[PDB]
Symmetry: C3
């Protein structure tokens, strides 16, 4: 039924740290196999996003607040989306890429589903490696 | 105290599937009585949103990334909000309506609160059927 | 490892209620020490946001839908971000401040991490009081 209890972790990233690398380090340290971002708040200086249907990554630098950071992650993969707001309330969003740097802080609550395992397997329909959910066993 | 442990489900919707119908099918299959979207990431082609205070639904078609999908759902009701971003980072958001179609994928982590039951009961204050939380018992 | 199980609460705020005060009342009533917004949907009339890097709070009044409300909260502190959409799909976001009032409803699922305790301690790096996570014990 792809059901499972959940174990949660709370963490705070520091100024200057790059988000993707830190999330991967956390996933590795705790050997998370089926995790997702359950909650997130903070700020960024550098932002790296890949807009819908775009192949290239867009790099931005400024004063940004993280409005939402959603998605799944595991030992060998992830799929995260980010939305940020600037000093005038304007928001931008897309597929989060490596390169986002913490401004003052990034608070996160990450959930792990012990009974499941996430992997990225080729989907003949979309043509990309998509989320595959199987029992941890 | 309206407190409860939570059971989580992970799922992936496929290209071409309509979100509301699939969420309802999942709710029905597992007989979820007090669920909420704990995490979500993906993409859409068709988007159906009802903007703030509007009576009519706005239908859009294009290349969109799902930035956030939040809300509650249960056997006989739901209340979900969606935010999407286009190929240029521009975002749009509102009350999600039936009609949103998956582009490449939609990854979801849904939580269910076994000790509670969600229902929609008339609120003399707002004038609409609002979320009512009671013990599962 | 800053890990913990989670206990969840579901609640609905009423028309006219101010969000910060109600969240604090809920935190106080249940003596929550390490909580976060796990899910949220609803509408607002008055919106109080502090944009990225800004010192002053921006006050708005109108017809808004809550697209996302994220962040942590505890007995003596909180850090929440809000994103809202107007009658034309336009979104605005920032650091949520006291002053946001419910329009028709605000549905929330709040998680509490029993094994942890959140506090705000001075960070010599950012220069502000930041999230500090310690064991509940």
């Amino acid at each position: 039924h792809n059901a499972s209890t959940a174990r949660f972790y709370a963490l705070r990233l520091l100024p200057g740290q790059e988000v993707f690398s830190q999330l991967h380090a956390f996933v590795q340290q705790n050997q998370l196999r089926a995790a997702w971002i359950a909650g997130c708040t903070g700020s960024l200086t550098d932002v790296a996003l890949r807009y819908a249907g775009q192949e290239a990554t867009t790099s931005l630098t400024g004063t940004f607040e993280v409005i939402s950071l959603n998605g799944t992650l595991e030992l060998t993969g992830e799929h995260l989306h980010l939305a940020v707001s600037d000093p005038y309330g304007v928001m931008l969003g897309g597929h989060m890429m490596p390169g986002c740097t913490v401004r003052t802080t990034l608070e996160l609550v990450i959930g792990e589903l012990p009974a499941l395992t996430f992997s990225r397997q080729p989907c003949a329909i979309s043509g990309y490696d998509e989320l595959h959910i199987s029992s941890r066993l």
